[PDB]
Amino acid sequence: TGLSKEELLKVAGSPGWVRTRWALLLLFWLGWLGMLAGAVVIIVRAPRCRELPAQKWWHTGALYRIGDLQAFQGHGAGNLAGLKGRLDYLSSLKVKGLVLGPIHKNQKDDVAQTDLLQIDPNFGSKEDFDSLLQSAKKKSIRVILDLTPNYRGENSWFSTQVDTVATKVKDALEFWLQAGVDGFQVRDIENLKDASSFLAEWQNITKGFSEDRLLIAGTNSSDLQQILSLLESNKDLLLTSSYLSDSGSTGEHTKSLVTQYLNATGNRWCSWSLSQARLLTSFLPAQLLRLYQLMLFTLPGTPVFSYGDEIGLDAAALPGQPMEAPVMLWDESSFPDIPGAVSANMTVKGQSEDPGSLLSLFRRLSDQRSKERSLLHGDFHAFSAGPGLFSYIRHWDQNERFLVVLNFGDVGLSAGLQASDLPASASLPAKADLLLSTQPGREEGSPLELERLKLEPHEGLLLRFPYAA
Amino acid sequence: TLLNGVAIIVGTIIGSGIFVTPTGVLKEAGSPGLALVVWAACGVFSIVGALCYAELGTTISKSGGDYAYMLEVYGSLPAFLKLWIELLIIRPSSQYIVALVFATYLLKPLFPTCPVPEEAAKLVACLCVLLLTAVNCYSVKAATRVQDAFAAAKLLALALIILLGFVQIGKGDVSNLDPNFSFEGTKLDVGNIVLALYSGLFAYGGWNYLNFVTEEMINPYRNLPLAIIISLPIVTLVYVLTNLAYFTTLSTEQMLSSEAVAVDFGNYHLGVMSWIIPVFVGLSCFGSVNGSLFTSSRLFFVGSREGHLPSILSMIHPQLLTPVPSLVFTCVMTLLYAFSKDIFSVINFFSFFNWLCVALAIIGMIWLRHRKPELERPIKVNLALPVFFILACLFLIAVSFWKTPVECGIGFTIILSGLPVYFFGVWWKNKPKWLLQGIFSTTVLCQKLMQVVPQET
Ligand SMILES: CCCCCCCCCCCCCCCCCC(=O)OC[C@H](COP(=O)(O)O)OC(=O)CCCCCCCCCCCCCCCCC
Ligand SMILES: CCCCCCCCCCCCCCCCCC(=O)OC[C@H](COP(=O)(O)O)OC(=O)CCCCCCCCCCCCCCCCC
Ligand SMILES: *[C@@H]1O[C@H](CO)[C@@H](O[C@@H]2O[C@H](CO)[C@@H](O)[C@H](O)[C@H]2NC(C)=O)[C@H](O)[C@H]1NC(C)=O
Ligand SMILES: *[C@@H]1O[C@H](CO)[C@@H](O[C@@H]2O[C@H](CO)[C@@H](O)[C@H](O)[C@H]2NC(C)=O)[C@H](O)[C@H]1NC(C)=O
Ligand SMILES: *[C@@H]1O[C@H](CO)[C@@H](O[C@@H]2O[C@H](CO)[C@@H](O)[C@H](O)[C@H]2NC(C)=O)[C@H](O)[C@H]1NC(C)=O
Ligand SMILES: *[C@@H]1O[C@H](CO)[C@@H](O[C@@H]2O[C@H](CO)[C@@H](O)[C@H](O)[C@H]2NC(C)=O)[C@H](O)[C@H]1NC(C)=O
16 A cells, blocks of 8 residues: 555654645635635625615506496496406406596586495495405505596586585595505596696695505696696606607607606606507507507506507497497407407407417516516616617616617618617627517527618517626 | 434435525426426435435445445446546535535625626635635534534524415415416426426435435434435425425515525515524535535545555544545535536536436346345335336436536546546556656655545554
């Protein structure tokens, strides 16, 4: 066995080997403390964390407007308990709320015979309503109660004396919060005299019980300056309007509205909806339906939708139907008046199996909006590109970055995405993976080149690329 | 003793890989429905494996373990090739993971929502090892007291996760997740399932070379094979309850994002949240590379005595004696895995050769059931049980060339490097005689360098 023995070693290992043993021992704890602070250097000159901005429940996904229950289901089932089975579909969409109503007692056009506290018995009773809230709250879908008083007439706010009309609203906010609703909505407040004083008082009342409650409001106004008068003293007030509803159909015109409405408010929470009551097919042609959706689910704010917006519910494509509240379609047996006027593609069921349908587009987008921390509360910066485009970037602290490319014209172009203005924290790479498209005909997963990106007429793109430098 | 056969053997098999691997099964299964199945399918598979070693540890039972069990069966360059793998692949890389996890649970309480940089988690991993390999070059009897305080911390963490995960469902909103969306779905049946199994199989191991000394010191004599069938379902019980604290209190996107799941449970659950969880998870991972350095030296004494593994190793220091050339050899190989890219690229690299080393050890049992009977088996299991084990274990490896063959490509590269140093090792003709003086020259230089003397021959 090849060695030097215990006693023969103690002869040979002593002389000056003690000093080269104490030297290698002392070089250890220096090379250890050298690696110690050499790690402590990296932990101090490391980029820290943005703290997370205390989100509320409506920040995290779309809402859903349901005005006519009658349509919402059909005939025979147009009630609250028949609505209660639809939450399996509403959680199929991953919404976070429901604009529900108005459901109170409105005969017609009368102040003394319109009580906001009593339900209308064409829907059910309070115990049916408490069944709805309790069944919804198990799936974590909140319920927002619409309180527009004259929801059956021409003027919504009873053109005679108004301080008793607001007094009816003053106690109705107290009543339904005790039943446990999580938000309200008034509408058409251009028919309200002195809107900005009553809204700010009701905002003091909606926040008067807790802070997990919101108060949406509507108007038909598309004036950028008129909205800000309403948002003057009120800042934690959502406000949907017809601001995006006027078309133009061009990107730089659309780019101008989104940037200015963000610039004039600064950086608060918006609510990106085309109108206050109607659908998207009221204001868009047949090929732009696939293209807004994506933009709506990606802008900084709460997208607000109506029923049928995910299936392309067109009232013009189906005669014998009320424009205000079209047949909530579901299947082929959904339009019972004229059979054969509904194709397979049109209902909820026929599109729920096609991976290229418009409803299939809605579930992928509402997925990513409710999970990706960039699209939740990342910051918004758009940049310039070609003449008929609108591109922008969502990006938070160190998470996944997103890139949206929209072509609002019918001429096939290239990108020309000159950044030239973005920070290094949101600086573009050369290549980035593709997440989805609106038109089929792309390789989902392959990293495309942005300088050699060619666009098709009416095609949206959502891409992604990680945090790097 | 009846119950102490289980209480010793439960804390042995509960490793610190429970703080790592829930993220790794979750990103290879999809939903917590199919994720909790993998924790149960790894539950049953290791009762089968520990029975195959509860009998095979009792037949031969020389000294030196899994190596020496194969030394009886093959007794040649297959024995050295099994030794060349464990010094280089299994024992280094499993210690790096526990060291790397010690870093990320220490640097993640001050990086709450962001990701720890790769270059700083390695230099706290290396620091943890080099600090801890130098304690074991000092006093062993001082390091054994250090082994005491880390068993208690590994159990206080894994109970306080449970009792906070228990009251979180009992306070209100029962079935707060109820997610099983890919319990029937997101299942490739070959690629992603096996990769989810490797994370589950890592999560408790050491039912192989750790139980034979566990039974021996009390001598309760062959009531141990029930005593593991009592024991390992307790471990699968605890490893499934801890995921139930994860999938309810966290989300499926907050889990797959982070590197330290246990602090995300700790952050949401309490506001103290810093004196409790990354301490107790931090002490628990700090012990599994400590006690991997006590037991590291045993292998060298067995290999050098048999004529393998040149005799510079298996020499012990004078004053404050400790196997000094061996611990230096292990910590060097441990830090050579700091050139690695991802931690779950290491667990897939570790568990390839772990589960081929196990599978050839049990194929060698059947060929010792076929050939050479009447070897006085105190325990013989039903022979239909080990053939359940190999046919699964060939299924893990054969899919692991369909999936990531490049790391297994450099894994078979390193074991063709053990072949010429075998022929240089023992087969070599000592004819030229220039080198025989040099082998004696190189060896006595290190002895003078470290002050280490041979065993009492
Ligand atoms: C890294 C840790 C350093 C601290 C510990 C010192 C350990 C020194 C040896 C390290 C390797 C130990 C395993 C060797 C493999 C097993 C061999 C065996 O079992 O032989 C038994 C055999 C029997 O020893 P005996 O029982 O003591 O007679 O020992 C030897 O043959 C020693 C042979 C040493 C050389 C091995 C072959 C190397 C070939 C490639 C050399 C390349 C050098 C680098 C070139 C320049 C690069 C810049
Ligand atoms: C930046 C990279 C990190 C810095 C260096 C990384 C690698 C350092 C070496 C390995 C890590 C050492 C851990 C600490 C070990 C000593 C701890 C201790 O206090 O023990 C008391 C121990 C006993 O005390 P004594 O009674 O004073 O001897 O001290 C020693 O025996 C000296 C140990 C120091 C050895 C450091 C260098 C290792 C020599 C390797 C020789 C390689 C050439 C030979 C050929 C083989 C290669 C093929
Ligand atoms: C509640 O609405 C009022 C009236 O629009 C807002 O104005 C506050 O009025 C109260 C009345 O005493 C004053 O104490 C506050 O100083 C006013 N605003 C400020 C600067 O706090 C008020 O902003 C609304 N909500 C609150 C009270 O913040
Ligand atoms: C909101 O809708 C009304 C309905 O057409 C628009 O027209 C106003 O109608 C009321 C009575 O119906 C008149 O008293 C107003 O004078 C009408 N407005 C104008 C400008 O003539 C109304 O304009 C719409 N609001 C906006 C901001 O466009
Ligand atoms: C809109 O945002 C821009 C900053 O991006 C600002 O606009 C500046 O307005 C001043 C005064 O009108 C000009 O002198 C600057 O040249 C403008 N800068 C740019 C980049 O346009 C401002 O913060 C916002 N605009 C307004 C009217 O407030
Ligand atoms: C179901 O979708 C199909 C195809 O989009 C529609 O059928 C097309 O209708 C358009 C009307 O503009 C015609 O120009 C095409 O020739 C039709 N395609 C075929 C293959 O005939 C159909 O209308 C949709 N369903 C309903 C009820 O409208």
